[PDB]
Amino acid sequence: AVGACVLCNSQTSLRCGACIRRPFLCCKCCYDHVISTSHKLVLSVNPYVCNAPGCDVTDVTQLYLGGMSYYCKSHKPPISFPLCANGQVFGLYKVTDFNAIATCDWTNAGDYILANTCTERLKLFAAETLKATEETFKLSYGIATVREVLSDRELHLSWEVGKPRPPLNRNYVFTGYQIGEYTFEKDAVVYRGTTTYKLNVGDYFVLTSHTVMPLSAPTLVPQEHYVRITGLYPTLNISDEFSSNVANYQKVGMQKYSTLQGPPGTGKSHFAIGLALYYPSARIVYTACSHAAVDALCEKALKYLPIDKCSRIIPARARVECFDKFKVNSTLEQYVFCTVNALPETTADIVVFDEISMATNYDLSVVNARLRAKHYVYIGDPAQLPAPRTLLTKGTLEPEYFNSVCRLMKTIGPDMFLGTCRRCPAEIVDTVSALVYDNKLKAHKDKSAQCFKMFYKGVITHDVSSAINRPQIGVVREFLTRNPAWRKAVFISPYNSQNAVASKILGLPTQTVDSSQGSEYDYVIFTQTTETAHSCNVNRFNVAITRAKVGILCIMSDRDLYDKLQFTSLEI
Ligand SMILES: [Zn+2]
Ligand SMILES: [Zn+2]
Ligand SMILES: [Zn+2]
């Protein structure tokens, strides 16, 4: 009931009862909150409400101090002090941006912009509130009950009328009921039970709300710059394979935190595992938001790091199938591969945070709060995709507002830039280099002359809100007959429903652009599907076409992105 002020850090008992994270505000500022905002409830030991029986006045502006207790203008004694006056609110030890964070609903991009252009404690308040707000919204959705089970991987569902029905995708993980997490992919719909169990008629699923914990630690600890490699011990036998990264590996030592912008296929994974071989005594924790991104740093470790000092930290409530080749849940191994949401309380010589574009400031804080370390390494690309902000429906989130790392990368540059794409045909590298990397990204590979674009708007249908374009799938059918080499291509689109249909018609494996991020395939077929803000997002486009090692076919809906593709145009 006693704490410090989440603007100035002055000691107070004054929380805001109105704010969803009951923040401890100082007297001068708790005033400037309640007189600016609809927020009028103030707490301390006991609530600032009128003590007169049957009186409902809780607005601190309408309240007074009468002896030891509080009352309204209708109930105060003659000797009484107004709680709200002299620019302060009476409390123990006796802003715009703080108001906006407290009061906003997180449906606008300007709410996320502010939550990344503010002070560090506000960012934590913001991140807490947002996640808080995110969670409380999940309740508002309608339960889904199994009517009948068609087969092993399909069924039909009955919804609770009144409350809305959330969109069926691989982006909305339900909790079945306690028969493990499930998901839904396009009556006939698919039921993806992460735990193998015979689906019972009557049983229900719910979007379970993992409660928001408060944030102690900042997003970014303060930066520290040294004269020499503090706390680590470098070799000079570092295999030529990692010789390019030595000046940067030394930068990692002569700094507290370091930021690496690596465009697709420029050797992030390689650099991370290569930091262990250069500081080979060092205990390292490898962390990223997703099981896939951690499972990626595991594969690039199996190859170069001794398998005996590697533990894949699995959360005891196991989500989806994971990395096996390591010892499971050995916290104190030299090498620890763990999702941010499963990080144990520990310390380390180096922490590498990978896929930083996908980090929420929450995620940045949780990592700092579970890991005290000599050197923090933040690896990814603000030109790739951020974490989906499910409440955001109005405006676009620019990369300089993804989190504090991305904001740094976009304003004063990253510390270190991997400037050579080794994965992609030069047609792709040349395209994204101009589109999102101010031409600073260079192609190692030659043009493949296997990169094709076709402008074909086709016909957009919608399965609820997810888009389909059958004509664009029909153009890909025609192309596959004339290009049998592409029979092994991964089909990629910005939409699950399109993928659902292309699966059934083409027979190719299927991937949304967002789930393609971090992966690579010889041959990619991309149907843009629609001409929306979603399907024309330059970061999503960037990711989509930089999945390809050898060839890509882009069926485009957007003239601009179509013209920008430095590919051979096909005809039909
Ligand atoms: Zn408030
Ligand atoms: Zn204050
Ligand atoms: Zn009263």
Instruction: Tell me the DSSP string of 312-341.
Output: E---SS--S----SSEES-TTSSEEEEEGG
CATH number assigned to the domain comprising residue 472: 3.40.50.300
User: In which order are the strands placed within the sheet that holds 371-380?
Assistant: 327-328, 310-312, 335-339, 284-288, 346-354, 371-380, 257-261, 416-417
Contacts of 68 (CB under 8 A, 6+ apart): none
Answer for the pair 339, 328: CB distance below 8 angstroms, yes or no. no
What SS3 string covers 346-390?
A: EEEEEEEEECHHHCCHHHHHHHHHHEEEEEEEEEECCCCCCCCCC
Containing structural domain, residue 527: 421-564
- 169 CA to middle of ligand 2, Å? 44
Q: 361-370 and 404-411 helices cross at what angle (nearest 10)? A: 110
d(C-alpha 49, C-alpha 481), whole Å:
76
Q: How many other CB atoms sit within 10 Å of the CB of residue 320?
A: 13
- 7 CA to middle of ligand 1, Å? 13
DSSP 533: T
Contacts of 284 (CB under 8 A, 6+ apart): 275, 276, 334, 335, 336, 348, 349, 350, 351, 352
Answer for the pair 548, 434: CB distance below 8 angstroms, yes or no. no
- 20 CA to middle of ligand 3, Å? 25
- 92 CA to middle of ligand 3, Å? 23
- 10 CA to middle of ligand 1, Å? 17
Cited resolution, angstroms = 2.2
Query: Measuring CA to CA, which residue among 385, 421, 422 is closest to residue 402?
Result: 385
d(C-alpha 243, C-alpha 561), whole Å:
37
Helix (H, G, I), strand (E, B) or coil at 516: helix
Radius of gyration of the chain (CA): 27
184-185 and 190-191: which strand pairing? antiparallel
Query: Measuring CA to CA, which residue among 388, 386, 379 is closest to residue 403?
Result: 386
Helix H or strand E encompassing 434: helix 426-436
Experimental method: X-ray
Query: Measuring CA to CA, which residue among 97, 130, 87 is closest to residue 6?
Result: 97
Burial of 356 (0-12, 13-18, 19+ CB in 10 A): buried
Breaks in the chain follow which residues, C to N over 2.5 Å? 94, 177, 186
- 6 CA to middle of ligand 3, Å? 30
Measured from the alpha carbon of residue 66, the closest ligand is: 3
Measured from the alpha carbon of residue 72, the closest ligand is: 3
d(C-alpha 358, C-alpha 384), whole Å:
9
- 413 CA to middle of ligand 1, Å? 36
Beta bridge mates, 311: 327, 336
Residue at 264: amino acid letter:
P
Q: Which residues are annotated as a binding site for a ribonucleoside 5'-triphosphate?
A: 262-269
- 47 CA to middle of ligand 1, Å? 14
d(C-alpha 555, C-alpha 528), whole Å:
6
442-443 and 420-421: which strand pairing? parallel
Structure tokens at 384: 């790739």
442-443 and 310-312: which strand pairing? unpaired
Ion ligand 1 neighbours (CB, 5 A) are 16, 18-19, 39, 102
